[PDB]
Amino acid sequence: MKSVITTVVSAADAAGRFPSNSDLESIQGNIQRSAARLEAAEKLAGNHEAVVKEAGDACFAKYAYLKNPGEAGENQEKINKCYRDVDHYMRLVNYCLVVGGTGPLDEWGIAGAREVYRTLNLPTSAYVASIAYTRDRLCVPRDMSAQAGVEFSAYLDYLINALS
Amino acid sequence: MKSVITTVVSAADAAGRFPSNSDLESIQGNIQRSAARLEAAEKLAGNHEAVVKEAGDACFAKYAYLKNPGEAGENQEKINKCYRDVDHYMRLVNYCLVVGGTGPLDEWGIAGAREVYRTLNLPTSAYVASIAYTRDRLCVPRDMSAQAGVEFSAYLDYLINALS
Amino acid sequence: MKSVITTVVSAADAAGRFPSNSDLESIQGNIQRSAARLEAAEKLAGNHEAVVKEAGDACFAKYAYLKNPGEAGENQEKINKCYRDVDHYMRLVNYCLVVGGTGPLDEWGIAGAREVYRTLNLPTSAYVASIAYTRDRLCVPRDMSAQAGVEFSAYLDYLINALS
Amino acid sequence: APAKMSLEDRQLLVLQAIKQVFGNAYVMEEERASFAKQESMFLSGELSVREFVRELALSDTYRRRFFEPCGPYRFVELNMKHLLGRGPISQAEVSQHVQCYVNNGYEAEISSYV
Amino acid sequence: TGYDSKSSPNFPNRAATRERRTVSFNARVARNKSQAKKILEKADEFFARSVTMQYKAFACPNGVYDIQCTEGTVKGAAYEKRAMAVSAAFRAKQASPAAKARALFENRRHAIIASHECQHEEDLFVRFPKLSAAYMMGKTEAMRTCSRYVVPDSLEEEYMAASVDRQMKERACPGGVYASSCVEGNAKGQAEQARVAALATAFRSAQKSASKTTAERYSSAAYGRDHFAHGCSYEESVFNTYPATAAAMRSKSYNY
Amino acid sequence: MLDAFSRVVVNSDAKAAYVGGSDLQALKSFIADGNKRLDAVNSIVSNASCMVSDAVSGMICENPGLISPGGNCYTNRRMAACLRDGEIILRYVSYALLAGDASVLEDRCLNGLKETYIALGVPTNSSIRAVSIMKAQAVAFITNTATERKMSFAAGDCTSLASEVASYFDRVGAAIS
Amino acid sequence: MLDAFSRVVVNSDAKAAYVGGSDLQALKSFIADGNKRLDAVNSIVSNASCMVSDAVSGMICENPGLISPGGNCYTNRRMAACLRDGEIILRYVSYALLAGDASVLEDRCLNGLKETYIALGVPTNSSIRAVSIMKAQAVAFITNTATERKMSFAAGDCTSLASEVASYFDRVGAAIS
Amino acid sequence: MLDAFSRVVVNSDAKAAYVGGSDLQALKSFIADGNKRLDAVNSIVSNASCMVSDAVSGMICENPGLISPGGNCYTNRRMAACLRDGEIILRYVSYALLAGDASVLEDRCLNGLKETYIALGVPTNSSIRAVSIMKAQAVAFITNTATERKMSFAAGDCTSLASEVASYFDRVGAAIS
């Protein structure tokens, strides 16, 4: 994967040179800003089945076009296919929020995503209108902290522009 | 070409990716330790020739056979050259602690060391005897501050380990 | 650009060889089924402008929700940004139903179409439905015969599965 | 005389600039053969038609014709008739072309005009 | 005097043409087509660079480095690799005028094999000398159809990886002479390095992953069937059962 | 490429001194404002689909000419690679924002970009209007005047740092013309 | 230069063979429509102030991005050279349509004209919309099948002179791009 | 790659397990003692040339049969290649000093060497003993019992980090035998 830590050691095994003060900053660096970031990682999974249902509902007003006969989200049992998928993409980021990496964002989520989503016709902006609900319904006075809850929205964009 | 700033953004050209938030925490952790590397910078530049005169005549006695006629340092012109060629050892780490990584040292002083010390017949024992004198003749709380004793000391024996 | 001639003389040129009777026998099949394939070029010079109101308005009854401000067809002027792109696909298959093969289609027609549309929020599920009215409307006595009935319609089906 | 040289109509392009630069004088074929490097160096493409005109003027026959009998006002008007195709303007542009000869030589005098 | 120095009378100074015989063109045509020579040589050193640095993004498809980029393993020999890396260009510069002519068009042989699928690909490829002299290199350093990333599994295959490499020692010599391409050292600045650099990355040939080195036996196999074995089905029946014959034997334009 | 720590090494190597205390007052100004140097970059790359889209869809309303043939954007490949050409217009500047100089910009791509633009026939009236329409939207995500996008950051001012990217894309505008 | 009778004597000078009764039949059939050659040449220069001027009133009419600011046909310094550019291209084709050989058109006009548009930034898709007009009207002039101008000539076929002037338009076409 | 930062992540990925306060103490056990992690590794890479330099002359003063004619250290390649095989395996342990997992060292070097150490006769008894000459001093540098090079550290304890390094000399010592 791709983290704070293994981007530093990716240079030395290539070039063959041994770790001097090149490899002496970054691992010291995430002691200095992670206290709101480990605060943020439990903050998803403290109310996560509420925020599964808080995000994934509102796009069915803007995209109600599966309920007609002749689409993918046709009957009631596609809702069981729907909100199971809401349990999964936010799991990729709070796993990263203890580290500060973009690794399982790319190791698990979005690698090969444009191939499958035109094969099975996954509607792209129908996802993002439910997904950007969490981008906008946020009060960094009250809900989260503004030190690294903005880093959570500096990583929820990496869902959004790579799903677009 | 190898600093804290150009860690990932030279390899992000080999990634097809932007500076993401794996790439931006890692520089802020240098800034809390950037209040100890300028406290060694002009501290070295304020004692720049009194650390020449300490390290200089220490190494001429450790290998006394170079003052013989018909050796390398036979005359008087080449023995201020050996003051001149240990000058840039303690002048390139005066560049290198500013940039945080190993930038000015790995390209300008050390890159191909023994290939021009063997056909020139410069034995590097008489190089590093000047260094290993003042590698450990540097007290921590009285020459400078307390973190500055090992802010200096990452390249203090790595300069011998680049010749090793 | 990709037909019977523009792939069989590259195979003689990669093997460094003259035309023998291998590629002589395999190219004379171009002309007898061209006599009915060009009757679709003789068909819709006179209904290039009225079939786009029966089939380019056939992607709009199910997708009538997309005239909100913020969608693709947000204005009548953004149905005007549909009205040059939706009939290009029939015009780009009009360019290659001249040639027999599909060589003008896989240079500028589909060849890099969906690399823009997820960023300009354009779903191609309603792109297939525009020429899915042409998936049923071709007469077997009247328009052309059923010898070229699938030769009209597999080129319509060529522009389906390249969008998938 | 135009641009875009062939090899057939170099024979037009050369002697419609021999006749300009020598001032419609008679250049015999023994004097034509003294140009046999620089006339050859034009029909390569080493020399363009702006710089062949300098190379015709930097000959021995141009030095024999318009420098060895000709005094200092007769020198600077036969440069100007042949290299620029005009007469002098005032007194300031003759003495500025006098001291291009005296202080810094004759081959910089002719090539001041080109 | 009252001395003065203005600007130059010959400031372009003929910095555009020193072949000193044209085909008797003009003065205006000879200036701007020499201005096209200082432009259309300087996009040959762009378009081969600007997709091979995109082909260096296949070396990090996630973004971090695997052991594709084993550069110099022992610490001091990273700047020792750069001596014959820049002599790889210098010895390619001093190749013969009989060899420099065929380096153009036998780089153009497989250039239209890789660009038959799009007409926007082939027009750039037949308009540049040094594009497909690096593109054939730049495509095989990514999906690994050299021998640099492939190991012999069979000793059968190690008898056939060692069967055509001496045919790549055949065409690096026209007689008893040796060429400038199959060399091994330049100034005895090494001791044993071209065998040291081989078996350091021949260690890397069998330990990246398993799935790194199994679809490359379905990448390189149909590669040589498309490129070389399309005209002889005896030649692809040594290719499919043994993929240590299709990632080995090369094009003739760049040598050995 | 380099960094702006080593750009002062370019300001010191030809004189060859021991680097003192008085001449890092703009280099300890780099660590004083280095949070603010990095507090600008996240509203660029969060808006990675916003910044590219109005660069091309701003061109079509203000210049409807090139869409019709005989024009520099006609195909879909002329939409899929023209938006991709502005991808690395932004990306090769996106390393230089945190750095502080021209260490990564002109040595790696803009050593002659106009000698690449001539051989395919790239219209430089479109190129100047590319890099000016995104530099005008770059600092508008910094000065908090976007027509939708409103952040929640710390207080202060980056009118000192507004001439960082303004001095970047005018050099990107220099090499394309 | 060369013409259609100068071509055959240098075709046969490589053989060093006398031109006798073999290839004189192609040139004794030159003069049978030798009047029809000249009767088509004055059809070009009759309406030539209209011929260069619907090449700018139709080309900009379906591509108005060339007169955009910064464009290739923007300013009126360029437009006076652009009508100067199109009228010599019509001039050298009529020199080669008359003499029946292309070797006054390629060697005196066209060698270097590839890099007139390389060295200036003049495009290629613009100039083929300004020369596919002229390949269409000059074969519609010489039939007198046009709409407005009606040359009342003698009746009879002239389509050998249609493909004769058509060979120059890809000879000017493959050279410029 | 994966760190110890990600080895605790893929010990929860199978059972759909969201992380809580007792799951981020698998990595806040790291970082608040991670100032010692910066204080541990940088002094065994400083003295890193004399690790193998005592592990060769000390190897033959404890076993003088390795330099025998036919031995694996007699030829002058086979001592100049012998310190290549052990200097970077300190760095492979030093890659696990920074990380905390040992799944990179068996998967960048040790996946295929013990079956090639038989394929040219590299011995298996002093495989783990050639680890076991610098195995004293590298644990004794991070815990500061060293006599010739005693350090000036921020004092305290690394004994839980000394069983971290005692796990990884054998983890590169397992896959060589």
Ligand SMILES: *[C@@H](C)[C@H]1/C(=C/C2=NC(=C\c3[nH]c(C[C@H]4NC(=O)C(C=C)=C4C)c(C)c3CCC(=O)O)/C(CCC(=O)O)=C2C)NC(=O)[C@@H]1C
């Ligand atoms: C004296 C006790 C020494 C010794 C010194 C000599 N050094 C000679 C040349 C030399 N040294 C360096 C390295 C150093 N100087 C730099 O400027 C830089 C960075 C750019 C570094 C790392 C260089 C580059 C040179 C060459 C320049 C020159 O010739 O002055 C030298 C003369 C060469 C010779 O001996 O033939 C001497 C005597 N030599 C000794 O025997 C002990 C070890």
Ligand SMILES: *[C@@H](C)[C@H]1/C(=C/C2=NC(=C\c3[nH]c(C[C@H]4NC(=O)C(C=C)=C4C)c(C)c3CCC(=O)O)/C(CCC(=O)O)=C2C)NC(=O)[C@@H]1C
């Ligand atoms: C509403 C009717 C449709 C829809 C239409 C839109 N298409 C838009 C842009 C567009 N279309 C194409 C494809 C076509 N045009 C070409 O020039 C060529 C190749 C020669 C092809 C195949 C392209 C390339 C583009 C982008 C640039 C352009 O306009 O040419 C478009 C504008 C985007 C917007 O307004 O947001 C619209 C609305 N899209 C839909 O989702 C519905 C079903």
Ligand SMILES: *[C@@H](C)[C@H]1/C(=C/C2=NC(=C\c3[nH]c(C[C@H]4NC(=O)C(C=C)=C4C)c(C)c3CCC(=O)O)/C(CCC(=O)O)=C2C)NC(=O)[C@@H]1C
């Ligand atoms: C002008 C360019 C900007 C602006 C910049 C300022 N930022 C200030 C403080 C600041 N911002 C951050 C967040 C930064 N650190 C990170 O790790 C990440 C994620 C990658 C980001 C975005 C930090 C940590 C700080 C320092 C103190 C704090 O937490 O607030 C700031 C205050 C002055 C100062 O730096 O001391 C300014 C002026 N502010 C603006 O108005 C525009 C948007």
Ligand SMILES: *[C@@H](C)[C@H]1/C(=C/C2=NC(=C\c3[nH]c(C[C@H]4NC(=O)C(C=C)=C4C)c(C)c3CCC(=O)O)/C(CCC(=O)O)=C2C)NC(=O)[C@@H]1C
């Ligand atoms: C001189 C004005 C002659 C004349 C010449 C002819 N022009 C012919 C075709 C043609 N006309 C135009 C311009 C026109 N087409 C447009 O699309 C627009 C506006 C946007 C205009 C003003 C063009 C560009 C072309 C040819 C390119 C093509 O084929 O697409 C032509 C042949 C047809 C005809 O008989 O008109 C001739 C003879 N026509 C005249 O009326 C005067 C006498």
Ligand SMILES: *[C@@H](C)[C@H]1/C(=C/C2=NC(=C\c3[nH]c(C[C@H]4NC(=O)C(C=C)=C4C)c(C)c3CCC(=O)O)/C(CCC(=O)O)=C2C)NC(=O)[C@@H]1C
């Ligand atoms: C490099 C000079 C270091 C350093 C290293 C240390 N080596 C330590 C112990 C040790 N050394 C050897 C080799 C030595 N013993 C012999 O019998 C022979 C010759 C036949 C030699 C060259 C051995 C075998 C051992 C023991 C290792 C083990 O038990 O497996 C050592 C620990 C002892 C001590 O602290 O005094 C250290 C620290 N010493 C230094 O400080 C520099 C930096």
Ligand SMILES: *[C@@H](C)[C@H]1/C(=C/C2=NC(=C\c3[nH]c(C[C@H]4NC(=O)C(C=C)=C4C)c(C)c3CCC(=O)O)/C(CCC(=O)O)=C2C)NC(=O)[C@@H]1C
């Ligand atoms: C066991 C491995 C060691 C040991 C470990 C401890 N280190 C402690 C603190 C500490 N060390 C550093 C320096 C580190 N940061 C850097 O930037 C660089 C390189 C230039 C290094 C080496 C720092 C910054 C700290 C934090 C507090 C301080 O400044 O001293 C420590 C105290 C507890 C703690 O981690 O906070 C311990 C126990 N010390 C030893 O004596 C053995 C050998």
Ligand SMILES: *[C@H](C)[C@H]1/C(=C/C2=NC(=C\c3[nH]c(C[C@H]4NC(=O)C(C=C)=C4C)c(C)c3CCC(=O)O)/C(CCC(=O)O)=C2C)NC(=O)[C@@H]1C
């Ligand atoms: C000084 C002893 C005299 C005197 C001399 C002046 N001569 C002036 C100009 C001039 N003189 C000549 C003749 C001589 N100079 C040459 O360069 C050549 C060769 C071609 C010769 C035979 C010429 C051609 C000129 C050029 C005309 C000019 O310079 O304007 C002169 C300048 C007058 C003025 O400023 O216009 C002077 C003063 N005159 C004296 O009073 C004493 C007796």
Ligand SMILES: *[C@H](C)[C@H]1/C(=C/C2=NC(=C\c3[nH]c(C[C@H]4NC(=O)C(C=C)=C4C)c(C)c3CCC(=O)O)/C(CCC(=O)O)=C2C)NC(=O)[C@@H]1C
């Ligand atoms: C197949 C026969 C190829 C070929 C392979 C060789 N490469 C050699 C050295 C070498 N090659 C690269 C480039 C490689 N690294 C990358 O990141 C990418 C792109 C993703 C590529 C293609 C590097 C960095 C090195 C340096 C390692 C070293 O040798 O020190 C090589 C050894 C000879 C040499 O180049 O000096 C071979 C045989 N070489 C070829 O000519 C064909 C096209």
Ligand SMILES: *[C@H](C)[C@H]1/C(=C/C2=NC(=C\c3[nH]c(C[C@H]4NC(=O)C(C=C)=C4C)c(C)c3CCC(=O)O)/C(CCC(=O)O)=C2C)NC(=O)[C@@H]1C
């Ligand atoms: C000395 C204490 C050892 C010992 C070491 C030897 N190793 C020898 C050769 C060799 N080593 C490796 C692994 C090395 N190459 C790599 O690329 C990497 C990691 C990136 C490592 C660690 C390889 C692959 C080879 C084969 C040669 C090659 O590199 O192509 C060696 C030379 C053997 C010989 O030449 O006969 C020695 C002596 N041998 C011992 O007995 C002790 C245990």
Ligand SMILES: *[C@H](C)[C@H]1/C(=C/C2=NC(=C\c3[nH]c(C[C@H]4NC(=O)C(C=C)=C4C)c(C)c3CCC(=O)O)/C(CCC(=O)O)=C2C)NC(=O)[C@@H]1C
């Ligand atoms: C999905 C319903 C299947 C399944 C599919 C997978 N196949 C995977 C990798 C893979 N596939 C092939 C065969 C394919 N590659 C070719 O070159 C050719 C033709 C010659 C074909 C048909 C190969 C050779 C490989 C290995 C990859 C490589 O060579 O680089 C694959 C990837 C595994 C992974 O992501 O780790 C999948 C998921 N697997 C399933 O579970 C069901 C049955």
Ligand SMILES: C=CC1=C(C)[C@@H](Cc2[nH]c(/C=C3N=C(/C=C4\NC(=O)[C@H](C)[C@H]4CC)C(C)=C\3CCC(=O)O)c(CCC(=O)O)c2C)NC1=O
């Ligand atoms: C893991 C993520 C996570 C969250 C985001 C919150 C989600 C959340 N939002 C609200 C509920 C609310 N939250 C707000 C506050 C705001 N709404 C806005 O649109 C403003 C931007 C912002 C001001 C700071 C308001 C006004 C309501 C009531 C309206 C509503 O959203 O239903 C509530 C009900 C209790 C409350 O009022 O706070 C909860 C649990 N909890 C979580 O566990």
Ligand SMILES: C=CC1=C(C)[C@@H](Cc2[nH]c(/C=C3N=C(/C=C4\NC(=O)[C@H](C)[C@H]4CC)C(C)=C\3CCC(=O)O)c(CCC(=O)O)c2C)NC1=O
């Ligand atoms: C940046 C480079 C730099 C230096 C090298 C010193 C240089 C220096 N050394 C000494 C002088 C001294 N400094 C020491 C101190 C020590 N000797 C040791 O071996 C121990 C490691 C250390 C104790 C911590 C001693 C013992 C002397 C007296 C002997 C001598 O002059 O060398 C003095 C006189 C005042 C003082 O004692 O500090 C100075 C200015 N200062 C600098 O600014």
Ligand SMILES: C=CC1=C(C)[C@@H](Cc2[nH]c(/C=C3N=C(/C=C4\NC(=O)[C@H](C)[C@H]4CC)C(C)=C\3CCC(=O)O)c(CCC(=O)O)c2C)NC1=O
């Ligand atoms: C490019 C596409 C293209 C077309 C579809 C027609 C468009 C078209 N549709 C109809 C009109 C019609 N055409 C048909 C014929 C048929 N309807 C079907 O469902 C069958 C496929 C087919 C019989 C074999 C029928 C039934 C109508 C009347 C209903 C209608 O409007 O479609 C007419 C009137 C005369 C006629 O019937 O042809 C025309 C010109 N022309 C075109 O150029």
Ligand SMILES: C=CC1=C(C)[C@@H](Cc2[nH]c(/C=C3N=C(/C=C4\NC(=O)[C@H](C)[C@H]4CC)C(C)=C\3CCC(=O)O)c(CCC(=O)O)c2C)NC1=O
């Ligand atoms: C696939 C594209 C392709 C071509 C278009 C041709 C063109 C071509 N010819 C030659 C190479 C040559 N071409 C000729 C040909 C001739 N010399 C004469 O005196 C005659 C007029 C004429 C043929 C009878 C000769 C003699 C050489 C070899 C040059 C030499 O060694 O002297 C080369 C260099 C090949 C090399 O050695 O690398 C190339 C590319 N060959 C190709 O491979």
